[PDB]
Every structure is written in C-alpha cells, then in structure tokens.
Amino acid sequence: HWGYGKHNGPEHWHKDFPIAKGERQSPVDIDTHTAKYDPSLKPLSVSYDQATSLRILNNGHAFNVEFDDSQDKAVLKGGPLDGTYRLIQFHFHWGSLDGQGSEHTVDKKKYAAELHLVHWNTKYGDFGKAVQQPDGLAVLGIFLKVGSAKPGLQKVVDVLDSIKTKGKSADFTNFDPRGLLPESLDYWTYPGSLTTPPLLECVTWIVLKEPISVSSEQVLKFRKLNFNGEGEPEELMVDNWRPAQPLKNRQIKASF
Ligand SMILES: [Hg+2]
Ligand SMILES: [Zn+2]
C-alpha cells in the first residue's frame, strides 16, 4: 500500500488516488511576499481546556493522539472559519535529519517537524461526513524547530516506547494540547487537502507563523518509531512528509 519509500512514496500516490493531482492539494510553499494580509479575518479561538485525550496509536505512517469528540470539549472557531470544529486527533510529520520534516514550507524553508491538530465541522455530525465536504476539516499546522526542549511534549515523548510498531496503542489520558501552542496565534490560511491518501480536498489550513522549538533529544525519539508491524524487518519511521504541491488557482491569506 501507500507509504513514504522510493516504491510507494508520494510520487506514486496518484496511481491509486488520482486526486493527488487535483486543484487544491496540500502542502504548499508559503511565499510570504505574495500572501495577502486580510483585515477581514477574525482572531483564532482555540478552546482546549476541556480536552479529553484517550489514546495514542502507531498507525504505520505516524502516531496519532486521539481525543473524545462526542461533545464540544475541545474546539476551534473564528479565523477564517464558519462554525465550530472539534478536535479529533493530532499527529506529526518529521525528518531523518533536522533540515527537513515539515510538509508546509515558508519561503522554501523546511522545518524539523510539523504538528497537525485535526478538527471536523460539527455541522456534518461525524468525521466521515465532514470528509465529503469542501469546508469539512480545519487543520492547525504548527512548525517545530530544534532548540530548547518543549516541556509540554515530554509525556508524548515518553510513551513512544510502548507504541513502537504499527498497530500498537497505549492509553493516553489527561494530555493537555495547550502545551504545544506557540505564544502567538498569527497565521496564514488557504483551502487545501489531507496530506495523506485519500488526499480529500476538504481542508481549511491554518498554519501558524511562530514555530515551537523542541530539543534534539525529543525529535530523536520520534525517529526510533517503526513503520513496520511487530516481528517485521525494521524500517524507521522517518521522513513521513509529502513535498509541496502546486498552488494553482489559490490565494494564501495572512492574518497579520
Ligand atoms: Hg471534501
Ligand atoms: Zn498531517
């Protein structure tokens, strides 16, 4: 199936997912000179004080920290959005080296990693219905650079041990996502898609200007994960990022 290797990588995704060549693909390079300041864009509203994390799972392409979205406990609203979006899960994309790992690029600059906070439009009732709508999902994208440790990320780091291989899961309660947020909420927004198959063009991307820094030892731990299932030949989970796609007919707006 699809993956990130030279034989099943992003360059091959179109064969099974023709929308890989669609008009609103993600990620893209954020050219800051061309992005347009939109004074009509409201401030982001992040309400995560009632967030209920449940578990973490190695899905074979990343590790997802899953949230209870049966009620409006952790929501995203405002910015360029109309309505309430509920947090379903958060995951990352990282590199084999500190010089790459992010999906989105700013002036072609790649970061060490990229965090994606996935939310679905509550007017569609379920995540699976939201995925059939142009305004179905809202993804908060946060860049990671190597520097000082991110205090807030250590519980995630520490549990990786336990979900080393694909299909493995561990209980993961009382994790507060607020500890992964940069100080500033300034952002860039554009209409896009999922970055992995099925690549559905249902996303409203919100990529924060300010990166969060993490230590070298923290990102090191992410690189110890495996794409493979237990008892299979070891393949380190590294470089699980999709390169920039053509902006085509779109406008990147800035909140600042
Ligand atoms: Hg869609
Ligand atoms: Zn992602």
From Swiss-Prot:
Residues annotated for Zn(2+) binding in this entry: 91, 93, 116
Reaction(s) the record says it catalyses: hydrogencarbonate + H(+) = CO2 + H2O; urea = cyanamide + H2O
Main localization, broad class: cytoplasm
Mutagenesis / variant outcome for changing residue 118 to K/R: Strongly reduced CO(2) hydrase and p-nitrophenyl acetate esterase activities
Feature type site, description Involved in the binding of some activators, including histamine and L-histidine: 89
Binding site for substrate: 195-196
Pfam family, one: Carb_anhydrase
First-tier enzyme category under EC: lyase
SMART domains listed in its UniProt record: Carb_anhydrase
Other remarks in the entry: Target of drugs used in treatments against glaucoma disorder and breast cancer.
Protein name: Carbonic anhydrase 2
Organism from which the protein derives: Homo sapiens (Human)
